[PDB]
Ligand binder design. Sequence first.
Ligand SMILES: O=C1Cc2cc(Nc3nc(Cl)ncc3Br)ccc2N1
Ligand SMILES: O=C1Cc2cc(Nc3nc(Cl)ncc3Br)ccc2N1
Ligand SMILES: [Cl-]
Ligand SMILES: [Cl-]
Lengths: 4, 4, 124, 124
Amino acid sequence: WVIP
Amino acid sequence: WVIP
Amino acid sequence: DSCIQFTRHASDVLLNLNRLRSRDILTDVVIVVSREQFRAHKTVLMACSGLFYSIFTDQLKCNLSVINLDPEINPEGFCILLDFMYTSRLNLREGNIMAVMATAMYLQMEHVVDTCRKFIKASE
Amino acid sequence: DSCIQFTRHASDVLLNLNRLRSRDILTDVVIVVSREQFRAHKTVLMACSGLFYSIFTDQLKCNLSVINLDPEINPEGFCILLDFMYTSRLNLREGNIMAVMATAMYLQMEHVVDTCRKFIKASE
Ligand SMILES: O=C1Cc2cc(Nc3nc(Cl)ncc3Br)ccc2N1
Ligand SMILES: O=C1Cc2cc(Nc3nc(Cl)ncc3Br)ccc2N1
Ligand SMILES: [Cl-]
Ligand SMILES: [Cl-]
């Protein structure tokens, strides 16, 4: 999971 | 396009 | 093999599937969550959820145009997860995390359940 | 928004759509290319091809279970492109590049046409  |  | 790969292909496919959903094109099922209705593509639901995979591979249920979820399922939690299925983006907030995790457990969406458990563990 | 994103989601969705294709699950159309037949999901074809997008948004053609391609279309070129649609991998070879490019132009698959033109320009 990432900060888009 | 890349070499997978 | 000696194949080449187009890096953005999977993302572009999902973006187009979401455009079809937004215009209600070739949607083939309604998911009923209490008083709310959500139109979707059976194939996309199956590709994202262990529960929908089991439902639409069933010889009788594969032909249903309406699926009613368990009444304990929260429509907002379902909406957030349906958006995630079609975009890879999860709108996870302090106010919705419990409903989102409960819905992801029911829908059998393992990666969503995992990030929810981690975000909850960080706030305790 | 304040969304988080699961990097591998789009790839995992496409992998699952390809597993459904391999087991012939919820395929809803046959594409006829001369003596050959290819089963597929209309939504995936639309998401990858400008031609299939135009065909299945047509109020009459959207309901057809069989689509016949132009007889000049090569079945192997179509097979290679159908595999690309469901995997992001293109089996481009000296022996098939001309058929693949001609099929991608007909199907309106711009990124495939672009790499074919570049590979052809390199060999001249
Ligand atoms: O957390 C998750 C997400 C998910 C998706 C599917 N979907 C499919 N699985 C397989 Cl093996 N083949 C085709 C399809 Br469609 C099955 C289980 C799960 N559990
Ligand atoms: O080279 C390409 C690939 C492709 C795909 C689509 N598909 C869609 N396009 C739009 Cl805008 N909305 C929904 C869908 Br499905 C249209 C044109 C093209 N040209
Ligand atoms: Cl997931
Ligand atoms: Cl393309």
